[PDB]
Write a protein that binds this ligand. Structure first.
Ligand SMILES: C[C@@H]1C[C@@H]([C@H](O)CC2CC(=O)NC(=O)C2)C(=O)[C@@H](C)C1
Ligand SMILES: [Mg+2]
Ligand SMILES: [Mg+2]
Ligand SMILES: [Mg+2]
Ligand SMILES: [Mg+2]
Ligand SMILES: [Mg+2]
Ligand SMILES: [Mg+2]
Ligand SMILES: [Mg+2]
Ligand SMILES: [Mg+2]
Ligand SMILES: [Mg+2]
Ligand SMILES: [Mg+2]
Ligand SMILES: [Mg+2]
Ligand SMILES: [Mg+2]
Ligand SMILES: [Mg+2]
Ligand SMILES: [Mg+2]
Ligand SMILES: [Mg+2]
Ligand SMILES: [Mg+2]
Ligand SMILES: [Mg+2]
Ligand SMILES: [Mg+2]
Ligand SMILES: [Mg+2]
Ligand SMILES: [Mg+2]
Ligand SMILES: [Mg+2]
Ligand SMILES: [Mg+2]
Ligand SMILES: [Mg+2]
Ligand SMILES: [Mg+2]
Lengths: 53, 167, 51, 148, 122, 185
RNA sequence: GAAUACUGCCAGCUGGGACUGAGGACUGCGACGUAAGUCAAGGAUGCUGGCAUAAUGGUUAUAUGCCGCCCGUCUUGAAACACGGACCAAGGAGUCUAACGUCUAUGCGAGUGUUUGGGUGUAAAACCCAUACGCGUAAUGAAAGUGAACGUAGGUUGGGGCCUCGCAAGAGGUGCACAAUCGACCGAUCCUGAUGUCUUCGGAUGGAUUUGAGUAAGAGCAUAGCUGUUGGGACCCGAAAGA
RNA sequence: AAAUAUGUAAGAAGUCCUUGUUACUUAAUUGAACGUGGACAUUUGAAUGAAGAGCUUUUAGUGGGCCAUUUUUGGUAAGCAGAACUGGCGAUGCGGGAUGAACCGAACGUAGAGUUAAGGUGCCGGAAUACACGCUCAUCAGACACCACAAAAGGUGUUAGU
RNA sequence: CCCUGAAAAUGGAUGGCGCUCAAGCGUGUUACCUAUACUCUACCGUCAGGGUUGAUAUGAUGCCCUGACGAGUAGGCAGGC
RNA sequence: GUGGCCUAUCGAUCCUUUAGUCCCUCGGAAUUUGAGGCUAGAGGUGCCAGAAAAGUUACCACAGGGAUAACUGGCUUGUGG
């Protein structure tokens, strides 16, 4: 990771300033659109009890 | 010496007050209190009397003349928080009340040396009452039972709930 | 010497946030929205009403 | 003075600072150096190692005056000259007229060599001298004469 | 931070605050940490003196940095003294607080109902 | 209730004033309190704090120590400041001409500096002629060369001096100090 | 095609009630006003009435409402069916001394300590003083013994303060105390063994995973105080015993 | 082969580039360790906090413990005996559990006001003889955790259900 | 849910009275009550950070500004009677 | 390869003794015996951080302990019923 950080900093020294070396924790998800085409939501309910004995 | 001394003493000069930001703005009265309204006195020597509201004086008092000819209440000031404003109204566009004010009602300078062990009305007051009361009565006679209503005293009967009563 | 609450005491409210005057003048707390007549898809309605 | 002691502060408090449970007693662990090898062993071994046992040989009827030999270092050697001839001798370092320092008269038995005297000749009279002390005196141009 | 909240679930009620809640919270109960002291904000010059190096010049800049989690959120949040709220004015709404919000209690994540709770608490 | 993360009502643990009742020391303290407040020079703050120190915390500074400090490159003309006592030293035979400001000069130290051509100065004269500690050089004596320090940290393998009244053979040089007598330390 | 419920927002308006009024010339931030000023804007002012004394208030006795088990002690646990205590006055228990540790104050400082003694006296005081002696300025070894600078009293890393350049940020220089570390020096141990020679003495030079309560531009001596330590009757009172 | 618990790292005492020392090491101008000089910008290399951070001296009391959840040993068991983690009591009042060291809530300068916690709201007793859907009638009903116990078994009592 | 199973010694204990479409049992929605807890304010003390000398109208261990904090046996220390 | 494949198989001060260095001391000065030192092992403490140690008291004493038995009570209920 130290080697990669040096490589990123040197590349940013040429182009793409503010390479933001630090790691980050997992972020909350961004917005998204979920299409129904071929994926119509369809599911059933909880199941009745039965013995299986 | 009995007691030694304080090494240093407080200053005896009086400190000036900081500037106060409290401007005196005029009272905003209740909506139901308009001149000509019949009031019910809840306190004082005239407890429970029906009177006529005439003028809002600059000391925040109300100038009332519950007609002296009717119930014996003269032209006098009352506190607005010690009256009940009723829905009954009398016209007051026939009376002249700009003369009555605080210096009109300025009582006296009672002398501290003046003392009483066991025990008249000003002249101008009676004609002022007569002049105001002439127009007041003239307007009062127009609708029946006002004279009787003003002569009668207000009181609470058994089962009366003033939080549900309409005055 | 004494903390005065904004959200009351409009003088302090105006000392902070000079934009409160424009907000109140233009009634930005009561903004009428532009109407639109887009309709949900029949698949959405059928899924919503499905058993 | 009694008025500054914690005894005055402890008035009104039952245990007088000694504790209700521990309850200050006479000699709960013994008297003096009792138990140095048994129940005070940890303190003895941690703070006074070498306390128990014998080392070395005895000397019957030792007289400390036999071993009288106070030491003087070269860096203090020039304080045996009174300060008012000191600067006069320090300038004009002369071999024909060099100060005589009688360290035995000053009360010393051996001259040691902590070193760096000024480069001035001096005649140092001593009972004993360390090898380095003599080498430094000779390097400065002086001499050590032995006395008894 | 989600792991931290999940580790302190039984003792906290938390959720997602709205702009109205954040603005009222900062306006009424917002105090700055200046030289280890709790200073009522009460003025924009205090904020520009202690957070002007991040481009935060007013109480609304501070609110903006909080509601939108900006680059200098950490500095602005740490500048804010922890808000000291009263007990809720209409109560907690439940007979027993120390169950999860899902189970009829008060603790845990109550995502958008934290707004109602905090509004009654301040 | 508050879940306290630190001890409450904790004193800073540093002296805010001299422990002594020396009136002249208190006058020096009030002078350097004014200077430390009305100037941004950290010299005044350092001198003010040193004015509070105890005797073991202000060890004497030898004139040989002063001469060695003045031998530093570019420090030949600086004013040596000792918040404490300057003692004499006979191990040195040459002494430079210099200004030394100190609380106290011993008779020998003062005589040696004056003979060398310099001057001995009090801290108030130092304050007058250098209100911001200009071209000063603060010197401190050896704190850990105190005899009490030898016994601090006594224990197995620590290499410290035992607290002992009589020395020599028969005095704590036996079992515990050599392998032939039990063990060694 | 609307309405309403539910939820949410307004830097929308407005009525009633309660507690509080800290501060004491001005300084600030604002607001309304062309400005002049004014304001609810870094904490209460204005108007009015009664009394001016037991009226308010304090104390005390009582009543009422609710609450309140006997202290001290040992104890995990006491109101205890645990022990001491009927009551009151007076007395009643961490002290002094020898030696000492840490800390602090003071004097003087490579020194320091007059008070064994002498001189003197306004006479157990105060004042003055020689030679010694104690501790300190050298350690190490069982001892015979030997005994502290290669060098700006060393190098490296930090290090306050100071200095130079900089509006600043900062960059350089110098860096006391202190901390870590590699060295150097003194003694002990082990090894090596020069010139020389009472031919068995002498021990030069050079080493070491060794060792010391050492050196490396001294800090100590004395007086006093709290706390702590040991011996003493030893915080106070208490045996069965022994001589 | 988990969960929980547990070690280390997430850089300036760092990284990279040239070349200096050695008596160690290499076949060797190979390395090892420590360095001179040069480069790295402000996201100097995750988050949150940091109440000042480090350092030293000296000395008190204590060295009988006990309780609760959870894990757990001996024992038929015990308000028994013995361990583990944590929180408590001891050393601690206050509101609640009538009463109670340890339970619940909450920890305490002196007051005022507001709001609550746990617990409650027929009367004692401050607060709905509230609202809503059901169940139960006991010739020994039942009525809030710790907690002041109840079982195997059985009933065309009555209710719902397969 | 109720009933049988269900027997102990002074008279007694859902805390008591009492309570039966409950004032019992299960559940749900509100309103209300009150801790030395939380919020705001005043005052006391403590701790911390600060201001104050072209004489601060001669107290600078004083005066003042700001913030936070306050349980306590054994025990320690401080200021006072 | 610095004992046993690893995890157990062992022992202070004083005294005695042996080995080593042929070294230091016997203090008026030497020589030789003798003695004492310095470094390293052994002789042993198993109550194993290491006193040198038989009973009895129904004639008994003292300091205490409900930190602890012999009676009630309390928890438990194996056993008993
Ligand atoms: C059993 C026998 C003696 C024993 C030891 O010397 C006994 C005691 C004698 C004494 O009074 N004081 C002590 O310090 C030790 C020892 O060394 C063994 C090897 C041999
Ligand atoms: Mg106490
Ligand atoms: Mg008592
Ligand atoms: Mg006691
Ligand atoms: Mg004890
Ligand atoms: Mg023993
Ligand atoms: Mg309410
Ligand atoms: Mg009672
Ligand atoms: Mg007893
Ligand atoms: Mg008795
Ligand atoms: Mg008695
Ligand atoms: Mg008495
Ligand atoms: Mg006694
Ligand atoms: Mg006997
Ligand atoms: Mg005990
Ligand atoms: Mg106890
Ligand atoms: Mg109960
Ligand atoms: Mg209770
Ligand atoms: Mg709980
Ligand atoms: Mg009830
Ligand atoms: Mg009631
Ligand atoms: Mg002899
Ligand atoms: Mg016997
Ligand atoms: Mg007999
Ligand atoms: Mg007991």
């Amino acid at each position: 990771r130290v080697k990669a950080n040096a490589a990123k900093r040197a590349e940013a020294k040429a182009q793409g300033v503010a390479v933001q070396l630090k790691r980050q924790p997992a972020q909350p998800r961004e917005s998204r659109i979920v299409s129904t085409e071929g994926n119509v939501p369809q599911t059933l309910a909880p199941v009745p009890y039965e013995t299986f004995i | 010496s009995a007691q030694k001394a304080p090494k240093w003493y407080p200053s005896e000069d009086v400190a000036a007050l900081k500037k106060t930001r409290k401007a005196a703005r005029p009272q905003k009265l209740r909506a139901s209190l308009v001149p000509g309204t019949v009031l019910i006195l809840l306190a004082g020597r005239f407890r429970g009397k029906r009177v006529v509201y005439l003028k809002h004086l600059e000391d925040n008092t109300l100038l009332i003349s519950g007609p002296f000819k009717v119930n014996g209440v003269p032209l006098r000031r009352v506190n607005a928080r010690y009256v009940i404003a009723t829905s009954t109204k009398v016209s007051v566009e026939g009376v002249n009340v700009e003369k009555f004010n605080v210096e009109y009602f300025a009582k006296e300078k009672l002398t501290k040396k003046e003392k009483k062990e066991a025990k008249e009305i000003k002249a101008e007051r009676v004609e002022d009452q007569k002049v105001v009361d002439k127009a007041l009565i003239a307007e009062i006679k127009k609708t029946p039972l006002l004279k009787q209503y003003l002569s009668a005293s207000f009181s609470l009967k058994n089962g009366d709930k003033p939080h549900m009563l309409k005055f | 010497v004494l903390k005065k609450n904004p959200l009351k005491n409009k003088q302090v409210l105006l000392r902070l946030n000079p934009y409160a005057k424009v907000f109140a003048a233009e009634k930005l707390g009561s903004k009428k929205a532009e109407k639109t007549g887009t309709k949900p898809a029949a698949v959405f309605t059928e899924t919503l009403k499905h058993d | 003075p009694s008025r500054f002691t914690k005894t005055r502060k402890h008035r009104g408090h039952v245990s007088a600072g000694k504790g209700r449970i521990g309850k200050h007693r006479k000699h709960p662990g013994g008297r003096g150096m009792a138990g140095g090898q048994h129940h005070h062993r940890i303190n003895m071994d941690k703070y006074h190692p070498g306390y128990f046992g014998k080392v070395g040989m005895r000397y019957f009827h030792k007289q400390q005056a036999h071993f009288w030999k106070p030491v003087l270092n070269l860096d203090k050697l020039w304080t045996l000259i009174p300060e008012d001839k000191r600067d006069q001798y320090l300038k004009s370092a002369s071999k024909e007229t060099a100060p005589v320092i009688d360290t035995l008269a000053a009360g010393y038995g051996k001259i040691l060599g902590k070193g760096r005297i000024p480069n001035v000749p001096v005649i140092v009279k001593a009972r004993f001298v360390s090898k380095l002390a003599e080498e430094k005196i000779r390097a400065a141009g002086g001499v050590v004469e032995l006395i008894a | 931070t989600l792991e931290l909240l999940k580790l302190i679930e039984p003792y906290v009620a938390y959720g997602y605050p709205s702009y109205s809640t954040i603005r009222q919270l900062v306006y009424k109960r917002g105090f700055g940490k200046i030289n280890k002291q709790r200073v009522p904000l009460s003025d924009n010059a205090i904020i520009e003196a202690n957070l002007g190096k991040y481009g935060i010049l007013s109480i609304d800049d501070l609110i903006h940095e909080i509601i939108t989690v900006g680059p200098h959120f950490k500095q602005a949040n740490n500048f804010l003294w922890p808000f000291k709220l009263s007990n809720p004015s209409g109560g907690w709404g439940v007979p027993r607080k120390f169950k999860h919000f899902i189970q009829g209690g008060s603790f845990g994540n109550r995502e958008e109902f934290i707004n109602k709770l905090v509004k009654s608490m301040n | 209730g508050i879940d306290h993360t630190s001890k409450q009502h904790k004193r800073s643990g540093h002296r805010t004033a001299p422990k002594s009742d020396n009136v002249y020391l208190k006058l020096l303290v009030k002078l350097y309190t004014f200077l430390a407040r009305r100037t941004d020079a950290p010299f005044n703050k350092v001198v003010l704090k040193a004015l509070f120190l105890s005797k073991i915390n202000r060890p004497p500074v030898s004139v040989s120590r002063i001469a060695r400090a003045l031998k530093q490159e570019g420090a030949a003309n600086k004013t040596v400041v000792v918040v404490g006592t300057v003692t004499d030293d006979a191990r040195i035979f040459e002494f430079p001409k210099t200004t030394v400001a100190a609380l106290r000069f011993t008779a020998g130290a003062r005589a040696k500096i004056v003979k060398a051509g310099g001057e001995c100065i009090t801290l108030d004269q130092l304050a007058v002629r250098a209100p911001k500690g200009q071209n000063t050089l603060i010197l401190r004596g050896p704190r850990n060369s105190r005899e009490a320090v030898r016994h601090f940290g006594m224990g197995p393998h620590k290499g410290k001096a035992p607290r002992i009244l009589s020395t020599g053979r028969k005095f704590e040089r036996a079992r515990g100090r050599r392998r032939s007598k039990g063990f060694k330390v």
